[PDB]
Design a protein around this nucleic acid. Structure first.
Lengths: 136, 135, 94, 38, 134
RNA sequence: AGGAUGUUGGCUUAGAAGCAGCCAUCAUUUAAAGAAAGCGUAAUAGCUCACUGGUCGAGUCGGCCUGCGCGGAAGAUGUA
C-alpha cells in the first residue's frame, strides 16, 4: 500500500476536488488508463488494481503508477460523539480529476493491454478509459 | 483471405504454366480425401504433370490469355486443372482410371489443339501413346 | 499531403470558442514569420481523422482560407482532457 | 438458470435473446450457460 | 485397424503388443512371427512402425513402414533419449549428411518432392527433439 | 466437400497418439489444414473448430461520437 514515508503534518483539511487533471497523456509507456470520472483513490484500490494488471500480463513488460495517495483521511471510531478534536488517520487517498492518467503500460501488445486495463478498471470506483501514446 | 495483390500473382503463375504446357485436363475433385490427392500428386510429379486447384473466377482470367477460352464453361463447380507441361496426355489417361477407381468426382472437359474435349470422347487423349512410340 | 479548409474567426474569447466546439468546430491560430497571426476555425471531425496519422505532425500542410493556400506545420495541439476531441491547434507558417 | 445483473456470452454457442423485455442467454451446448438478467 | 511401432525381430509381449491389438480380435502369435519373419532384414534394434489391418472375420494384413524420424535421429546422434526441453537443452549433432540419409529412408516414407524438402522435415523433427544439426 | 504427410514431435507416464503436465512449434504435400480451438477415450478411436475449393448473388462486418429508452430495482394499515 502506497503511503508517504513521512509528512510535514499528520492531518489535512477535507478540501474540495474541483477542476480538471494535470498529466493527461501517456508519458512513459505506450498505453494508459485515463480516468474520466472524479473521486478519490484509496491506497488499497490502487494496489488492488495493480495486482489485477500485474497478474493479467503474467508479470511482463513495464507498469507505471502515475498517482500517489498523499492525502490522509481521518475517521472517528464508533460510539463517539461529535467534537473532541479531529479523528485519527485511517487511510490515504489520491484525488482524481477527469483526464488523469492513472496507470501506464509498455512492452505488451495492445489487445493484451486492453484486457489488463479492463481487469484493473473493475477494482476502481471511478469510470476510466483506454488511451494510447500519441505524437504531441 | 486473399488480397488483390495475391490473386493477381496467382493468376500470373497459372497463366505462365498454361503457355508452356500442351494438354490440359479439367476435373471435379470434390469429395476426395487428401491422402488420395497426395497420391495423385506423386503420380503427377512422376509423370511430369502440373496440378492445381484454383478459383473458377481466377482460372477464367488465366485461360483467356490463349488458347483455352473454350474451357470457360468447364469452370462451373469445383475445378481441378492438370497441366502436362512435359509430354502430352498421360494426365488425361491418369485421371480416368483414377476417376473410375475412386467413384467420387467425375471429370469435366479436357482441351488439346485449342479445341475443347468432350467428357466421354476424351478416350482419344487417354489412349495416345509415347513420344517414343514412333520408333 | 494534407489540405485543410478554414474560415476566419469573427470573435474570440471563452464564450465564442465554446460555441464553436458545440457546433462541431474548433478554433486554431496561424503565426510565424513577419505576418500578423491569423485566427481560424476548423471542422473538427474532418481534422480529427487527419491528425490520427503520424505524418500529420511532420509534413507541411496547406490551409486554404479565403481561397488562399498557406503552408504551415502543426506546432502544438490542445486535446480534450478525457474525450477523443481537439480543442485548439497551433499552426506555424512553414 | 443463472439470474444475475450482468449476463454475458460464456462460449461460442451462447446467444443473446430478449424475450418480454428480459435479456437472456441461451446456449445450445452448455445448459450451465443459460442466464437471464435479473 | 490399428497402428503400432514394434521392435524389429521382436514381438508378442503383453504390456507392449498383446492387449493392444489383442482386444480387437487379432491372432497374436501369427502376427508376431509374420512380423518378425519380414522384419528380420531390418538392422538390429530399429523400432519399426507397422499398420495392422483387421477384417470382420478377425483375419488381418499389415504394412511395415520406415522407422520413426525421432528414432533414426536418436541413433544418428548416438543418444538414447531426446531432450526433456528441446531447443532449451541441446543433445547433439547430426551432420547435414546424416539428415540426408535419414531423409532418404524416410524419403521412402515422406511426401517431399525433393531431397531438400524431406531433409528439411527431418530437420524439423531434429529441432523438435533438441538435437542440433552439426 | 476437404481439414493431409514426417508423426504416436521430444520429455514424462502404467498410458499421454493435437487435446493431464513440461519443452519445442518446425517442415512437407497443399486449394487449405494449428505439432491443434472445444467435446470425447484407460490410451487410441470418434465429433467439431481454425483454414480452404464449391454453391449463392449484393451487400455484409465492428469500433467511435451522441439522443431517448431496458435490466440492475425487495417492507411492513390501503392503490400510496
Amino acid at each position: 500500500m502506497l503511503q508517504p514515508k513521512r509528512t510535514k503534518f499528520r492531518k489535512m483539511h477535507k478540501g474540495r476536488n474541483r477542476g480538471l487533471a494535470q498529466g493527461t497523456d501517456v508519458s512513459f509507456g505506450s498505453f494508459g488508463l485515463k480516468a474520466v470520472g472524479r473521486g478519490r483513490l484509496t491506497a488499497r484500490q490502487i494496489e488492488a488494481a495493480r495486482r489485477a494488471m500485474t497478474r493479467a500480463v503474467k508479470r511482463q513488460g513495464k507498469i507505471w503508477i502515475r498517482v500517489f495517495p498523499d492525502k490522509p483521511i481521518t475517521e472517528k471510531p464508533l460510539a463517539v460523539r461529535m467534537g473532541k478534536g479531529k479523528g485519527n488517520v485511517e487511510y490515504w487517498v489520491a484525488l482524481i480529476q477527469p483526464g488523469k492518467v492513472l496507470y501506464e503500460m509498455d512492452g505488451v501488445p495492445e489487445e493484451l493491454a486492453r484486457e489488463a486495463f479492463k481487469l484493473a478498471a473493475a477494482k476502481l470506483p471511478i469510470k476510466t478509459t483506454f488511451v494510447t501514446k500519441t505524437v504531441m | 483471405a486473399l488480397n488483390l495483390q495475391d490473386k493477381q500473382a496467382i493468376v500470373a503463375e497459372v497463366s505462365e504454366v498454361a503457355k508452356g504446357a500442351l494438354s490440359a485436363v479439367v476435373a471435379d475433385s470434390r469429395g476426395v480425401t487428401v491422402d488420395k490427392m497426395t497420391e495423385l500428386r506423386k503420380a503427377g510429379r512422376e509423370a511430369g504433370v502440373y496440378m492445381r486447384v484454383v478459383r473458377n473466377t481466377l482460372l477464367r482470367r488465366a485461360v483467356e490469355g490463349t488458347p483455352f477460352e473454350c474451357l470457360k464453361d468447364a469452370f462451373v463447380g469445383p475445378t481441378l486443372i492438370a497441366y502436362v507441361t512435359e509430354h502430352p496426355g498421360a494426365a488425361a489417361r491418369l485421371f480416368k482410371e483414377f476417376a473410375k477407381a475412386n467413384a467420387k468426382f467425375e471429370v469435366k472437359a479436357a482441351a488439346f489443339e485449342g479445341e475443347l474435349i468432350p467428357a466421354s470422347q476424351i478416350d482419344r487423349l487417354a489412349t495416345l501413346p509415347t513420344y517414343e512410340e514412333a520408333i | 499531403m494534407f489540405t485543410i479548409n478554414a474560415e476566419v474567426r469573427k470573435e474570440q474569447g471563452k464564450g465564442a470558442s465554446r460555441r464553436l466546439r458545440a457546433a462541431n468546430k474548433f478554433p486554431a491560430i496561424i503565426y510565424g514569420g513577419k505576418e500578423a497571426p491569423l485566427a481560424i476555425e476548423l471542422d473538427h471531425d474532418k481534422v480529427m481523422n487527419m491528425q490520427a496519422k503520424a505524418e500529420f505532425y511532420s509534413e507541411v500542410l496547406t490551409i486554404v482560407v479565403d481561397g488562399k493556400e498557406i503552408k504551415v506545420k502543426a506546432q502544438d495541439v490542445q486535446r480534450h482532457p478525457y474525450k477523443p476531441k481537439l480543442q485548439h491547434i497551433d499552426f506555424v507558417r512553414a | 438458470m443463472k439470474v444475475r445483473a450482468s449476463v454475458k456470452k460464456l462460449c461460442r454457442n451462447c446467444k443473446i435473446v430478449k424475450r418480454d423485455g428480459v435479456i437472456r442467454v441461451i446456449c445450445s451446448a452448455e445448459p450451465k450457460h443459460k442466464q437471464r438478467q435479473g | 485397424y490399428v497402428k503400432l511401432q514394434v521392435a524389429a525381430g521382436m514381438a508378442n509381449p503383453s504390456p507392449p503388443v498383446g492387449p493392444a491389438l489383442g482386444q480387437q480380435g487379432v491372432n497374436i502369435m501369427e502376427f508376431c512371427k509374420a512380423f518378425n519373419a519380414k522384419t528380420d532384414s531390418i538392422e538390429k534394434g530399429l523400432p519399426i512402425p507397422v499398420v495392422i489391418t483387421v477384417y470382420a472375420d478377425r483375419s488381418f494384413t499389415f504394412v511395415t513402414k520406415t522407422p520413426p524420424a525421432a528414432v533414426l535421429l536418436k541413433k544418428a546422434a548416438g543418444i538414447k533419449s531426446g531432450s526433456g526441453k528441446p531447443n532449451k537443452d541441446k543433445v547433439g549433432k547430426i551432420s547435414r549428411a546424416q539428415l540426408q540419409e535419414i531423409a532418404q529412408t524416410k524419403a521412402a516414407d515422406m511426401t517431399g518432392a525433393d531431397i531438400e524438402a524431406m531433409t528439411r522435415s527431418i530437420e524439423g523433427t531434429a529441432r523438435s527433439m533438441g538435437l542440433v544439426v552439426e
